[model samples]
Every structure is written in structure tokens, then in C-alpha cells.
Target: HAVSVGKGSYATEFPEIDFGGINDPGFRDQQGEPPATIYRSDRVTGPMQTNSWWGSLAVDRFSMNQYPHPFSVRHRAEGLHVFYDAPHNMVVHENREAGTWHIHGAIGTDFTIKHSGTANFEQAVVDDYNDWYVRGLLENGAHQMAITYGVGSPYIFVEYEDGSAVLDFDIAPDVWEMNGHVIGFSTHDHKHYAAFAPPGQNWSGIGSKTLTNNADYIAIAKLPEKDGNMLAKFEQYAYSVVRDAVADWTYDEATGTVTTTFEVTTEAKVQGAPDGTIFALYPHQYRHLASSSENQLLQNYQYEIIRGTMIGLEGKRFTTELTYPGVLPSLPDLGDYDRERLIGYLHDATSDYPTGSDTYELGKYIGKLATLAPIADQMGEYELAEQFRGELKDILEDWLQATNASGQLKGKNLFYYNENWGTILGYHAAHSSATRINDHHFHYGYFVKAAAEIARADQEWAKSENWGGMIDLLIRDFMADRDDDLFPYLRMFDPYSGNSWADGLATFDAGNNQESSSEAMHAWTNVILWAEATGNKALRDRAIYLYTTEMSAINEYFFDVHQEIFPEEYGPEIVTINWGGKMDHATWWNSGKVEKYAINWLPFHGGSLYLGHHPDYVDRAYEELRRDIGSTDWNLWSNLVWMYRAFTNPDDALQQMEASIDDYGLFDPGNEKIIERGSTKAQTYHWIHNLAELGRVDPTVTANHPIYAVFNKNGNRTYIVYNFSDSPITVQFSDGHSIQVEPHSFNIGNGD
Candidate 1:
């Protein structure tokens, strides 16, 4: 089931998914272990996978330009799910753009595709880890056939090895009695499909999907087309094959808009083919196309695709942009919280505190402490602040120190570095943290964030010998500064997809998945704070890239910010878990919908301001959540739900807090008197009060510093920034307001 490559590298063979030629001994190479899944783009072809739309593709290694069979697609109501099944003949030729995995047919007694390229392996499959699509070769021996295919390929471009190309399909497809060579058929889940054989081409009838052609070139479409125009339409574009898809972006600090340009490089089979091959844009790319009054698409084609995504055409490149909702280091001390009330809540929160006996709960518990400590400092409760800070230091020592002050083993909860896997895992492994390698960032993020909060008050205490080293170790474990022998670069962060993945090994056929995009960002924000507090620019910048990129992806993929990604019939306002094969409105713990919305809302912080960027989507999403949860005010996650209400109506959120804080009081999940673990009543009060004054995040303005946010309430604009350094600095805003922040302090100013 698995194999060893480098001195310490290991990879799972994924025996179940393999059909045959892949994962054989020939997959070995000097670069170390091959990533268990094709989704790890750098090695094999390009990176592309979202909600299982990837599952709609598989390879037929018999021809150069092979067609895809509809029987492979799982077109369920939830979404289109496709899995590129492993195993095939020949070897996987690694490609950055359009890599192919051609096959070694059971033909030609000793020589064929392998011989042409030279040094072919005896193994059935050989992957350079650069395999994504396919380009096959058929030598006209033993009835052999080879096929090459890739995603976003609207047409199947065919080529031949010797005189002709042969395509064999499992289904007996009816293509209107063959072509002068144009074929058309309707699949169970899709329709309007058409294919072309070369001029004077020969094709079959009935259900048999196989075809043989004399000419070298061929083209096929997933949509309907007319026979008279099919040759000219398909041929003109077929010659241009998209070989590489490269992503380039710029974060315009002045405008707060991240302009992302996805440029595709194509390889024209011949010079005459169109330079701009017909490219189909996915929802995330097409929906946000930069406008010239929003330039209308030059051409258009339609297909009812995965989750209602628009599958249409552009050209060699396309550009789309999304606003980056600014984030701050933490809640900057916005004045006027009833000091006594916050002090009282802090007193009670810590008095009967539950410093969790497990890793995840401990992380979450420490997070709230981190949040409340700053609240205490802001409320002018100096004695309480120091006392809380000392307690926080002591508590961090319980885990960070890994031993009691007296030198006894702190065995109940601790960290362990697994050399074989090259990861440092926390014990009492929450959510299969040790075994499955899930949610390390989600859990340990609290520890790093909480430690950074303490680091600010006492830098000397954060010295590596003291505790900073441990904090950095956690950061390194989750996402290292760079790729090295010790840790993989961005261990769980998928660079191309622009989000963090939760599962480490990718054990399921569903492939890698992440449930809480917010929680993942919670971890990224932790790195930002930790880096800012301790001065790690590289680490800080990496986290920022991860944070902003994640926000964009979360908007398009998870939140469907513009209501573009999810299909109309999908019947859910948001998808909580985005799997490689599908998007789900459901969770593993419970069969409910409210948690689906709130999972992205847990532990609201300055980073959470992104949730307020699209007020329309926010209100619409909340309405659906409230409707599903029904009119029962006392729901499962009242705290989170009410906190979210601030996006549309902060007054409503504040009212719920006021009424509940006094009457119902605070209740833990156990008392079934529940709020979120990473949040407390005190923090909730601070959040609503600040949001009520600031209103929603003003995406129109930005600041140079990552630890800042611009808020606009009607005509009133609030410029808030937190200086994490000991030296004072003047923070400038794009809107022309500047704040002279004091050393180690939170400053607020008005631009209007």
C-alpha cells in the first residue's frame, strides 16, 4: 500500500484507486517520495482541484487524443465528482502544464511507446510525479490504442503515431450513425456532445464507442455543434493545446484589490492552429472577470456543470480580481466597554477556568485567555492584566516548557516530534491529530496565538531558551519558512488552490479536504501575530500570502461570495467542507446545517472582518441559517450566530449579548449552556461593541501594515491599527488619514 523513496521519505501507493500501470516500482526517483495524490501540482502537471469537479476526469492510455467517457462522471445533485483513477500502462511524464501519462499497451511484443522515448521501464507504470493529462502514441501494432486528456479541455485533440489513431470506449455510444466523421451523443448526466473524425474519417454506430481514423488530426466537444461547421470550428482550435496554466497576482495596497491573472501557455500542434485555444473558465475565474464596463465574453458556450458553475470560453488568458478585506493583529482597544462588566467576566472566566487536559481544547482555552488578557489591559485593569498575563505565562509554560517548573514530566498533555513523518504532534491528539494528521493548524494555532499575546508584554520572556523556540517549532511544523529536510514547505497549505488542507495523508477517495476555512485562517493569523510579536518577516509574509489568498478562495469556493460557485439546485447557502470530490453542507459530528455556517464563524477575530466584506452575501447566508435552525432563539451555537448578526445588524448582535449576558449567563457545551470554546462572553461583548461603532469592513481602503483595518459606518470612517513593535511608527492609510501609533499600543483615528 505504501513505498519508501528518499532516506526518510514515504508515500502511499493508493492501491484502491489504481487501475494498473501507475505506482509500480518505476515511480521512484531522486526527488524523494511522490506526493500520494495528483492534487499536489508541482510534481505532476499543474495544480487544479476544488469540489470534486476533478473526479469527472480519468485517463484512457491508448491514443494521442483520446475522448472521455461519460460513464466515469458522478453527476449527483450535490456536485460533479470525478476521480482520476490511478494505474495505467507506460510511464507518467512529469509536466508543469500539460503532462501526460501514456500507456504501454498489451501490444507490439517488446517495443512501442516506451521504445520511442528510450530507456522505458519494465514496470507497468512510471510517473515523474508530473502527470496530470495525457498524450498517447499508437504504433499500429496488436490493435493497440493510447489516449491523452486534461481538465478544462473543451475539445479532445487527437494525434496519431504511425498512420492512424484508434479510440476504444466501454460504452456503445450512439453518435447519429457516424461521420463524414462527426459524432454526437447524449450522456446520462450531460448532453449536446459532439466529436469529429478527420476528413474521410471512418467511425462506428450503435453503442460501441470505438473509432478508427486515417487522418492525423481530430477534435471533439462536450457541447452540441453543427456537422457542416464542426471541422472548421474544432480544427482551428484543436491545434492549440493548453500546456501550462500559470497564476500571477499583485496585492494593490492602495485599492485593496488582489488582481489575479491566470495565463495559459499553449503548444500548437502546427503553426496554422489558433494561438488562443478555446479555454473554458471556471466559476471562480469567470464570475469575477475584470470589466471594460465588464467586457462581454467574446465567445460563449453553456453546460450545466458542477455546483452550477459556468463552463464557458475565453482564450489564452483571463483575469479576475477580488477585494482583500483587511485584517488586524487583534482587537485594538476601542474604548468604552463597561470596565466593571469586562473585569467581572474576566474574573469569573479565569476563576473556574478549564485549562483543557487535551491538546485541542487546551489550545482553544489558551486562545480565549489570550483574547481576554488584552481585554483586561484595554479596560485599564492593570493589576488584572498583569495577573492574567502571569497566569497566561504559567499556563503556556505547562505546554511550551514541556515540563513542570520543578522538572517533572508533564505527561497529561504535551508535544511529540515524529521523526519518521517529520512532524511535531501534540499529545492527547485531538481530532486524530497524531494518527490522521488533521487540523494541526486549527488546534495548535491557539497555542501560537496565545503565546504571541504574552510575547508582546515581555519580549525577554519569549526568548527561544524560554518559550519562543517552542512557538516557532509549532509554526515550523504547520508551515515551515521554506522547504527543507526538516519540514515540507507549507505542509498543509495548497499553493495553487490558495487554501490550507486539513487532511495530511489524503486517505479517502474524496482526497484532501478542509471543513473550517476560518479556522485554517485562524492558524494563519496566529503566524502573523507570532511573527509580528517576535520579528519573523519571512514567516509573517508567508502567512500573509496564505491569509489573503485563502480569503479570496474562501469567498469563491466556500462562501461563494458572489453566489457564483454553488449550484442553484444544491440547496445550501454555504458549503462547510470542500472535498476533492464534492462539497458538503454536512459535517461528520452532527447531521445539521447551522454548524455548517458557524464552522466558518468560530473564534471571530480581526481576521474575521473578511466575513463582512460582502454584506449582501452575509445577510442572505444568515437568513438561510436562521430559517433552517427555525425560530427557536436558544439554538446550538447562539453565541456564534449572534456574533455574525453584527455583519448585517450589529444592534441585533449587541441586544442578544446584553439580554443573554445578564439573564442566561455563560454556559459551556457540557452544561448544554453552550457558546464556542475559543470565544467567551467578554470577547463577544468587545466584538459587538466595536463592530456596532465601526460598521462593516470598508474594503475600498487599505493600509501598508498587515495589522490594520478600515471601517466605514455611513459617512464615518474609523482607521484602526495596532503597532506590535517597541518603537513607535506612523501608520498611513490609503484614504489619507494617518495614525501616530504609540509603542506597543492599539491606536484608533477618524479619517472623516
Candidate 2:
């Protein structure tokens, strides 16, 4: 019933290791085991190290790149030669006499590494630990190893090993991370390099690196390498682990062969991380969680953690010293940052759509839930986890019910539909997708995330009709409209060249607004999400097609390669404005100087929309957008503008969102919430429609009053309010503000 990777090949042989279900989506039974699923230990490739806890590694520097921090491998010669680029450009060899490995730091600091031979390192196989009966030849030889790549580094050499430890970097071996664990990462370029080793190996370090982005950058391993017969001591078996972040996996088979060719490929649709894997929070669910300052702080902590993970593009995960995996007694107050809350703010932004007080709270709540899930797990209180998980599910269910006019989980009925505003481009089409696909594929990985969370809650959510109904609707829709009819026409509406010529994965600006996609960022996220959300063959095929095709289109049509960037193409060369900050004083959406009616947002507008699909797109898009906008850009309107349009018309709304945000709220607008310069009828102004639909001011029905007041140019005004408390409280409206209150209902906008 499931798709297989072709029998007898390297991929088919590896056993699949399911991590302990994390962030539940709905599927759990399908995900098996802990190490393989959570730590991805079964995918270990090589060894040796003296770590700085937050140290990083870069290798090859060109052909391949991996960024593995807390989780990475090291390779070296058998004679005890180790090399690394960090601390000090020092090369250390094993001191047989002292039985210790030593390296120096930049400022005359020396680090000594001691070797252990107890075979304490365990492999994650099928949710359990399986020790690899490994006893090094030199038990206490003080074995040490370092990995590095300098401008003029050797092809591959053991500076201190004997003749047997032969490794040549020129010949690319069968090396890769068992899971997607690259040693170091870069948020700017969205890339990394990891170290690996085949069975019966030594000095044949399986390390990788990124070349095009940085000059002479390198990645090193944190783990140590084994010199003796790797396979002989610890045999290689079928190994598979889910990149639940992106819902993909690495397959490996050891057919009792001396030379096993390792390969990497995307997994099939139906056989993903399962609904039991993902942990989640549903729409309108965070009101209760994010209510208290402590809850909000917890959410902020989560946002910070996820945001910190985004730094992986720079070959780094946030050090637990301040954020996650490591406990911090008192975390920093992330504050009201416009976008810099987490590694993947785009995901939270869109998931909590229709930006308003509730949406804001939703973001905070989701963050808090994710934040506490780990803490609860640490405290061994599964009940707290279950409670949080249930809350998330409830929100999601509520959102689905409200959005699904037909009582079916169809694509058309996804959350944030019409009132999504500028978030679509920033969150969905670009940031979420890029982040998921680029290195970790975390954005689209939400399906599995939700599944995992639901399972942890000890709830049979996936088994219920809720998940099945959504999947069924997707299948039916696919069968009926295999060709993206509505989407195709919408895709043609690119405002960049003022003509349609195969619009990319998104329609947004990366450089100007926080909502745009840069360099096919969202394309990847979309592909991953499509694969996860809809378990149909057709959807998977289409998702992959779109993913690859859009990526190519960007490189061919939109990019300025020499510029090493994708500039927003708002009609020829017309660029848009840049506004900064959440505070009233620092905010100004000045269009710099480029002026044009339609093509005035930014050249990167189209690109920003594309970014909505991928999590990796967040950083590059953020960087470009920040360059144009003053560093303090934080208008939620851009997110709302693009998202609203993404649903109605997929034409560069990311730009529209940015444009509207700049035009309306940026330039000393009388009121922060009022739309000043832009046309009231534009998609950016659709929040009124959502307000009309909610009948409540808070997107999540929590606040005592509405976050914004909707008004027209003709002095017509509507005031919306939300009452999260059990009993409602009445208050007098501001002058010229009227309310249309319906008892606990939806679509009651105008007052009598």
C-alpha cells in the first residue's frame, strides 16, 4: 500500500527510525522510536572533538556544505592527527605519552580532549538506544580529531596519520548526514555542511561545505572519529530517520558490502512522519495560553528558539545557554519586535492569520505552547503537554470549522483566507516554505508537527474524521482539477514586468517589505506542505514539480546574479518604500525615492510571495527587506496585505501589503492603525471584512475590546470589540465610532 524506494538499492535497505513523536500534527503510530526519530543517532557518520559548546564547523567550502552544531561528526587519520578552523588554526596530533589531545584557542587558550572507550555513545534505532559494541584500539590514547577548510587547504591529508589512513577530498565519497544534521548553518545563505563516514573507515572524513555564499568558510565536527575497522566494530544496518522539520528522510542500506553507495532522495507522500509526530496549536487557541505575562514570556521564548534555529543558515543553532535544548532560568524579553521573534516567524505569522490583537496573541500563544511543551517534557509531566496540545487542536478545529463553509477541509478553506493580509507572502509562500526545504524543511513540516503533538496529548485526533476529511477533500479536488486552474490564472498576474510570463512560487518583494519571498523561498515550503497536508500521489507529484520548476524560474527570470540577489521587480525597475519599527516614532514607510503608481513597492515584491512557502527564505528575504526598510520594520499590515490577496488574487500582494503598509502606516500616519495613503479598497484594507466576519475585535476572541477601528473616507466608522471573559463588559465607543453587536455571533458589522 505504500511507495517503496526501488528494491535492492541503497535507500531501500535502511531501517526507518521514528523520533519520539514531537509537535503533534495527527500521525503518531507511523513514527516509531526515539533516537532515530528525535536525535537521529542512527545516522551518525564519524568522530573526535573538544567543543566550545557553541562551536561550529565548515568543510570542503565548495562542493557540499553542512552546518552541524550540537549534533555533528568529526573525521581524521588513524595516526592521531586532528584539524579545525576555529579556536585557533591549530593542528593537533595524539600524544601517545600524555594520552591527551590538545588544541589552542585564538587568545592563548588551550583545550585538552580526553578519549573514552566504554562505547558510551549510543545509536537511535527504532525509538531506542542500541550501543555499537565499539572498543577503540587505543582506549585512552587521548584520541583527538578536528575538521576544517581554509582557502588553500589540502585535498585530503592526514597531517599525522600513517600510510593506511588515506583520505582524498577530491574524490567525493558516499558521505552525508543520516538525518539532516549538518555541523554548522548560515541564515544568510540557507546552507550547511556535515561530516560523515562509511563503515570500515578512518581519515575518510565525510564532511561537506558551502562555496558560493561565503569566502573560504568551513564547517567542523563536534564528535570524534573512530580509527579502527568501523564496520567490524559496529556494523551498519538499515537506517532511516525523519526530517520531521521538513517531513523528509535519508534512506541507507548496508547489503553486507565493502563499497556501499549512499544516496539521498525525497520520501513518498503517504509514508511521511505520520500525524503522530507533529506537535501543534490550532487557530484562535492561544488566547488562554498567551494571557498571562509568564505565558507570553514562554511564547516569546519559543519564538526566540525557533528564530534562533533560523540562524542555522549561518551554520548555527541558538545556543541553549540563552534559549532551548539547554535551560535558561530567565530568558530575555524578545519585546515587540516587528519580525525578529524566532527562526521561523513567518510560520507563526501566517498560522495566526488576519493580523490583529488576537493574531498577535496567537503568535505569542503558539510560541508559549511550543516553549512549554519541552519544559513540561523536561519536568516529566505529560498531562501539561496534553493540555497544551488539546488547546492547540481546539483552535485549529475552530478555525477550520469557521473557514470551511462546506464543512470540508479543502484547500480553499485554509485559515487566514481573505483577511490574511501581508502575511501570506512572508509566512506561507516564502518564509515557511524556504525554512522547511532549504536545510531542515521545518515550515511544511507542520503537518507532522501537528500529528506528533496530537499523539502526545494522548488523543486519537488523526484517527478521527477531522484529519481524514481534510485529506479526502484534497484528493477529491485533485482528481477534479489536476491542473491548477484558479492558481494558474492567478499566477499569471505578476505586477513585476507589467506582463505575465510564468510567475514564480510567490508574488512578493523580498527587499522592500517583510512579506515578500526571495529566491523561491516559499516554493520549497509549499512543496513540503503539499506533501504533508494532502496524502495523495497527484498532490505530491505536483508539489515536487512546482518546487523544482519555480526554483529554476527564479534563477532564469527574476535574479540579478552579479548583484548576487533577487531584486523586487515592480514594473521594470520601479522600487517601493521602506518603513521601520513598531514604535510610532521610528516608523516611516518612505519609498526611498523610486516612484510609480502600480510598480512602486519594491523590485523584490514577487520574490517575497515566493518566500512564503519556505522557512529558509526567511533570512535572505528578511535581510533584503531590512536593507531597504530601516532596520526597525514591524508593520503587521504588510503581512495582512499579502495574505489577504494571496487568497483572492495571487498577484504580488506581498508588494501590495508592503506598499499599503508603507503608504498607510509608515510615513507619520496620524494613527498607527489607520490606513492613510493607500486606497481603502485595496486588499490591504480587507481586515474590515474579517472584523465583520468575527463580529469580535480580537482574532482569537480573547481581548475585552477590538484591537483596531475600521473606518471609511466618508467618515463612516465601525468599532469591533472582543470579550474573552465569561461575562461581557460594556464600554462607550470613541466619538464617531459605532458598533453593530450581535449576541455571540459572526458578520455583524454596522451599528443601528
Global lDDT of each candidate: 0.57, 0.23
Candidate 1 lDDT score at position 416 = 55
Candidate 1 on 122-145: residue-level lDDT in tens? Answer: 111112111123332322243212
Question: What TM-score does prediction 1 earn?
Answer: 0.72
Q: State residue 348's C-alpha deviation in candidate 2, in Å.
A: 15
Q: For residues 66-154, what per-residue lDDT tens digits would candidate 2 score against the true structure?
A: 11111212211221122222312323333333222222111111111112222221221111111101111211133222222111111
State TM-scores per candidate: 0.72, 0.24
Error of 1 at 272 (Å): 7.9
